Design a protein around this ligand. Structure first.
Ligand SMILES: [Mg+2]
Ligand SMILES: [Mg+2]
Ligand SMILES: [Mg+2]
Ligand SMILES: [Mg+2]
Ligand SMILES: [Mg+2]
Ligand SMILES: [Mg+2]
Ligand SMILES: [Mg+2]
Ligand SMILES: [Mg+2]
Ligand SMILES: [Mg+2]
Ligand SMILES: [Mg+2]
Ligand SMILES: [Mg+2]
Ligand SMILES: [Mg+2]
Ligand SMILES: [Mg+2]
Ligand SMILES: [Mg+2]
Ligand SMILES: [Mg+2]
Ligand SMILES: [Mg+2]
Ligand SMILES: [Mg+2]
Lengths: 103, 186, 125, 52, 134, 52, 147, 118
RNA sequence: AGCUAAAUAUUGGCGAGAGACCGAUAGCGAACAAGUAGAGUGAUCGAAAGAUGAAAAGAACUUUGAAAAGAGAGUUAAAUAGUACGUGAAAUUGCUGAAAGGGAAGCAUUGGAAAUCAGUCUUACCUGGGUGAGAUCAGUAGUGCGAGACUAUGCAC
RNA sequence: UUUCAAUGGCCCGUCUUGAAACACGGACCAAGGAGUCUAGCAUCUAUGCGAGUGUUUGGGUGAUGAAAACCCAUCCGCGAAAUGAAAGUGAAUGCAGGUGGGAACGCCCUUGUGGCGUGCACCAUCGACCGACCCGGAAUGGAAGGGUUUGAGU
RNA sequence: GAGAAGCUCAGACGAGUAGGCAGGCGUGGAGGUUUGUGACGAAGCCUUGGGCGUGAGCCUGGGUCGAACAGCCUCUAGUG
RNA sequence: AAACUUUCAGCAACGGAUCUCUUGGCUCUCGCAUCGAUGAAGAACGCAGCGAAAUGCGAUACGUAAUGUGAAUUG
């Protein structure tokens, strides 16, 4: 029973948790697999860049709107103003985001 | 039979460091000799503190050293400060004065700022050469009870100590027994 | 040191693959060095032994004996050599098996396939 | 030197890494104990062994 | 330049190839290094620490070889660090006098003259012919 | 016995680098080489550095 | 490791340290922290007062990003600027004053603990305490509010 | 190595090891709640205790004043060159007959006594 | 109303490489003809069991016996390896030897008796005594300036 | 070592106030046989770094041989601020204060368990400062003035 | 010098269940080290022989046997 | 005095511990995607010179064709 110093215990181990324990013994194996897939992909699409160019967008909320990060794809207006048709954009590695707009 | 009651039988102090650091052993070797072959309470003080655990040897910052050696009635103007422990930096002290400090360890930032201000940093063996009995030295200690555990020690009814809680907020020990509107307060 | 991911240094696997080898695999496992004269003549270090090959025993109690290989008992990894026997209780002579690695071939039972094996192995006729 | 750096100069191949400082500047403590600056202020040596 | 001799002893006092320690008799320790005449595990007798140290080894078929460490400028050059002087074909009186002169009268390891003479004495006693009793 | 016993042990990167620095410094000390069993009695110099 | 464990010392001691009278039975006062109001009350009321009951309002679907506002005191303001900027302005007389944008250092409000040196500085922040603003203005500097 | 006294020469056998073959002779501290041996009733066996420890000067010494140092090869015997009057060589059981002869010879050259010669 | 790769899962199956794992009462139930033998109407339940030797060289032949076998022999490095086979513990048993014994035995202390074990001494080192032969020793000469150690050419015979 | 004599010696384990018990388990021997590992928490210790700290979610040398070693970016966790149910507000009168004891050091005595001056740590204590609460209090804001109080604060 | 983890001088003291702590003994496996042991006999086992330790235990003679095994510093656990 | 009983030792039994071994297990990782009305998985009965259990096979029956190897199989 409870008689020692410290926090009252909280451990969520009343289900059959040992049935669903996930170990990470394959962590270096997964890392090697993923690197080999990147090397295989790079040689296949060469000389195209392995990563497509992405837009720069401001993250939402006051916690992150001071920062800048990669977004999903360029807006239709952005492609229009840069003289790139939306059907041509994908053929040369330019992603199109029909959802994002320029406020 | 003999009627002897034995309370303070075994001494409760450390006779050597628990550390296995070979260089700490060399410093103990130096100060075992100095505390034995001199009549100086300073050298016995250094030897005793060289044994102490980490929690019993709190750090001190260069701000505290600068404040303690610059009191209005100080005369601790050009004397070496000595602590058996780590000397940390206080980045809040924008301008560091010229200080002479002897310490077990200096933080990289503390050491750089002491030197840049024209001061000096010594190890305890360098201190032994300069002041073999600790004459004209300021022996200092950090705050022993600043560590977290002393917020909790002695917790009990009306003791105003901190509870051990997994999280802080309402719903975490701020209810019955902690306010008058919930049975009683503490 | 081995480096191939397809090579196993497991003692358990190597022993299983040796003692469980099929008949045709055991033929290569039962190889003998060629003699010095034969090595130079055919540019070949060693060959799988064969019935009707001429050997001399190089190790063991029968070291220095010579004779034809009368049979290649592959189930036991053993060679039976002519006139290399021992006496049973009742006077009958029982052949004594010798490991292929413990003999050297002094004359080959050359034939069409053996000749093809020498050229394939980089040797000469 | 580019791998490990020094106590005051960052390692080129280890970002923000400096070699550690020791807690004793001169580890020849036998020399220090028998140095002039120490031997000239100690008390008289005292007996290493004493008669019963 | 120098790594401290006190520091070296701290590293190797309980871990080195030349220390033979046994738990018997309550923990005995023997030191086998070539530049340790006393054969006892202690900082002052260990040649691995001291700048000046001596060892007395047996020289086949007679005599002993005196081993000494050269000047500490060679501390980082093991090929030039050890000096091996063969004191052989001398009598016992001649041999002990030379060891005392080379180690003591030079002021090299005056604390190790007695032990070195004793060690040379024992080696010389071991090399004498055996009066085998049929 | 279970597979989710803790097999791997984390050490702080700076302590790991401290350990390697100590180990490299020890390799420069002929007494420690001899103590660790290396037959280095005849080598010309420690550290031992050969041409590229 | 197991070799240094107390279990190794109790081999041959029959009760393994758990007593002959009271023993090491299965849960003799219940499981987990059950009973804080009844047979564990003397512990809960002594070491975890406030545990039972409700206090305050619920807030459904709390999202912490609009509440984000870490704070920095005045005594840390000059530490947010690079060493070269400190040397150029701190303690000098210059026509321009340095700008300390506290938001790009990860702070949403500037609080007033501590003191400032007597050099002008422009503090760009979302929020500022009253006493923090007074001390900035006394040092000759200003607070300019940003979003 | 002078006047070696043993406080006790009996070995401290485990209680009831004389009555049950399953109970080995090697000493065990009795922990029974009724144990007459633990309570030291008169006429029961003695228990080992620190008072029986022998003089620190003569502890570990064989009757001849020497202490039996185990040797596995010639170089082990050479360890006892200077310690001729304090250590005797005990040759290990698993040393071959050939190596044993070389060890006996080396000890004789150094004047090291061998406990198990022959 | 609808489709869609990848990054994700994988105690089944197939193939492969490993291990600070277990080592025949362990490790899968199963290292072996094991989901076998065997049980139960049935659903189901479910074992035990590895090791002669390098090689059978697995004991010819003679003899006693109805035979099984024994005894001689033989093979082997070994039969103190004979298939009832590596090593071969304990409980338990036979024979031989020793000893003790009036309704338990065992243990402790102390000695007697009998049996049995160790001293290897006076070796080393030093000096004296007897004879013996021998490249002969202290100070020196010379070959890093002052002092000290060492080897080496000679003299000191 | 065995045995004899003299003297002593009850059957161990267990629950129990109390076991030699007419309390229970135990015919014998071998081998097996019971505080572990994991998610936490707490104290204590060691080590690294320190107003910071944490390379192993990931990515790279990498292909050779690579479950290791080694390297590398942005986040994020914990810490650097509290308080309040909350909206909110948010830490220097002063040498970051005063008082008492006090480590270490220095100076005077005159041989005492001394006097004098600084005073680290820690504890007790009087204040100040921040939040809550209770006040008066000259549409919105709560500035100066207060309080026996209150907070896991400064 | 006297493993400064050393050396040396002195005084007082010694019941212990439940329980607490320390220092040790022994076992499987891992890293390091020991011109480590071993078919001229490893390991194991028997013993009417010897030695060491207060003890856990350890070393050794003789017998048996046949292929591996140990000391020291560390790591570790399905460790008595 | 024997017999008898008891203890110890040698030898002989009984039994199968111990030690050493290990084509087995366990665990981890890597790789792969392929059952069936064109009759699967499973079941039964048969097939070899001398073969009952296992492997294999199906009246073309420890197999036929085809390809590779190249002298065995073996009690
Ligand atoms: Mg119990
Ligand atoms: Mg009760
Ligand atoms: Mg005894
Ligand atoms: Mg045999
Ligand atoms: Mg009685
Ligand atoms: Mg009781
Ligand atoms: Mg009882
Ligand atoms: Mg009862
Ligand atoms: Mg009962
Ligand atoms: Mg019963
Ligand atoms: Mg057992
Ligand atoms: Mg006691
Ligand atoms: Mg295990
Ligand atoms: Mg043996
Ligand atoms: Mg017996
Ligand atoms: Mg004893
Ligand atoms: Mg267990």
């Amino acid at each position: 029973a409870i008689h020692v110093k410290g926090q009252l215990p909280n451990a969520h181990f009343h289900k059959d948790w040992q049935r669903y324990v996930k170990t990470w013994f394959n962590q270096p194996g997964r890392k090697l697999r993923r690197r080999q897939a990147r090397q295989t992909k790079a040689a296949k699409i060469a000389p195209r860049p392995v990563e497509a160019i992405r837009p720069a967008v401001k993250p939402p909320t006051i916690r992150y709107n001071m920062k800048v990060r990669a977004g999903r794809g360029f807006t239709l207006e952005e492609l229009k103003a840069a003289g790139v048709s939306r059907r041509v954009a994908s053929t040369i590695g330019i992603p199109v985001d029909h959802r994002r707009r320029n406020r | 039979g003999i009627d002897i009651e034995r309370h303070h039988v075994r001494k409760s102090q450390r006779s050597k460091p628990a550390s296995e650091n070979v260089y700490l052993k060399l410093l103990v070797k130096l100060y075992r000799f100095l505390a034995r072959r001199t009549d100086s309470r300073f050298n016995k003080a250094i030897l005793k503190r060289l044994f102490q655990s980490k929690t019993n040897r709190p750090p001190i910052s260069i701000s505290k050293i600068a404040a303690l050696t610059s009191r209005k009635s100080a005369s601790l103007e050009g004397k070496t400060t000595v602590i058996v422990g780590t000397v940390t930096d206080d980045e809040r002290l924008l301008t560091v004065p010229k200080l002479s400090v002897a310490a077990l360890r200096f933080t990289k930032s503390a050491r750089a700022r002491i030197l840049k201000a024209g001061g000096e940093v010594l190890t305890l063996d360098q201190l032994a050469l300069r002041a073999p009995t600790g004459s004209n030295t300021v022996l200092l200690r950090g705050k022993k009870h600043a560590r977290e555990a002393y917020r909790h020690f002695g917790f009990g009814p009306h003791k105003h100590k901190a509870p051990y809680v997994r999280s802080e907020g309402r719903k975490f020990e701020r209810a019955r027994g902690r306010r008058k509107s919930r049975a009683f307060k503490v | 040191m081995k480096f191939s991911r397809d090579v196993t240094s497991s003692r358990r696997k190597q022993r299983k693959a040796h003692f469980g080898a099929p008949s045709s695999v055991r033929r290569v496992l039962m190889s003998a060095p060629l003699s010095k004269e034969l090595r130079e003549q055919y540019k070949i270090r060693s060959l799988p032994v064969r019935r009707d090959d001429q050997i001399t025993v190089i190790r063991g109690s029968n070291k220095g004996r010579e004779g034809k290989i009368t049979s290649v008992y592959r189930k036991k990894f053993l060679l039976l050599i002519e006139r290399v026997t021992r006496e049973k209780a009742n006077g009958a002579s029982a052949p004594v098996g010798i490991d292929a690695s413990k003999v050297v071939i002094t004359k080959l039972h050359l034939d069409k396939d053996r000749k093809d094996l020498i050229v394939r192995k980089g040797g000469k006729v | 030197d580019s791998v490990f750096g020094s106590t005051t100069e960052a390692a080129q191949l280890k970002k923000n890494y400096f070699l550690p400082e020791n807690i004793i500047s001169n580890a020849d403590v036998t020399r220090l104990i028998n140095s002039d600056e120490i031997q000239s202020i100690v008390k008289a040596a005292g007996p290493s062994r004493v008669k019963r | 330049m120098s790594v401290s001799n006190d520091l070296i002893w701290q590293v190797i006092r309980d871990n080195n190839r030349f220390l033979v320690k046994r738990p018997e008799f309550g923990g005995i320790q023997f030191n086998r290094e070539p530049v340790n005449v006393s054969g006892k595990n202690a900082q002052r007798f260990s040649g691995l620490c001291n700048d000046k140290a001596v060892g007395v080894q047996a020289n086949s078929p007679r005599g002993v070889v005196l081993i000494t460490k050269t000047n500490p400028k060679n501390a980082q050059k093991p090929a030039k660090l050890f000096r091996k002087d063969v004191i052989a074909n001398a009598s016992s009186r001649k041999t002990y006098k030379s060891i005392a002169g080379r180690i003591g009268r030079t002021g090299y390891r005056d604390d190790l003259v007695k032990v070195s003479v004793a060690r040379a004495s024992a080696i010389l006693s071991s090399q004498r012919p055996k009066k085998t009793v049929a | 016995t279970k597979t989710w016993r803790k097999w791997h042990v984390k050490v702080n990167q700076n302590e790991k680098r401290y350990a390697i620095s100590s180990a490299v410094a020890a390799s420069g000390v002929p007494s420690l080489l001899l103590a660790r069993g290396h037959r280095i009695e005849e080598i010309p110099e420690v550290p031992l550095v050969v041409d590229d | 490791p197991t070799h240094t464990s107390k279990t190794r010392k109790l081999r041959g001691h029959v009760s393994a340290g758990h007593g002959r009278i009271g023993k090491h039975r299965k849960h003799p006062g219940g499981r987990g922290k059950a009973g804080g109001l009844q047979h564990l009350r003397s512990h809960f009321d002594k070491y975890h007062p406030g545990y039972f009951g409700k206090v305050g309002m619920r807030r459904f679907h709390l999202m912490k990003n609009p509440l984000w506002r870490p704070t920095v005191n005045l005594d840390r303001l000059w530490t947010l600027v690079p060493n070269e900027t400190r040397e150029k302005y701190l303690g000098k007389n210059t026509e321009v004053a340095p700008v300390i944008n506290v938001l790009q250092s990860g702070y949403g409000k500037v609080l007033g603990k501590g003191r400032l040196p007597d050099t002008p500085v422009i503090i760009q922040t979302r929020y500022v305490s009253r006493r923090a603003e007074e001390k900035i203005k006394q040092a000759g500097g200003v607070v300019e509010l940003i979003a | 190595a002078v006047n070696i006294i043993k406080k006790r020469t009996k070995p401290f056998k485990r209680h009831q090891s004389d009555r049950f073959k399953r109970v080995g002779e090697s000493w065990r501290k009795p922990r029974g709640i009724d144990s007459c041996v633990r309570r030291r009733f008169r006429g029961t066996i003695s228990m080992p205790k620190i008072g029986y420890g022998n003089n620190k000067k003569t502890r570990y010494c064989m009757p001849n004043g020497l202490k039996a140092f185990l040797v596995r090869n010639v170089s082990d015997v050479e360890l006892l060159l200077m310690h001729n009057k304090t250590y005797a060589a005990e040759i290990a059981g698993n040393v071959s007959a050939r190596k044993r002869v070389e060890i006996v010879e080396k000890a004789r050259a150094l004047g090291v006594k061998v406990t198990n010669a022959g």
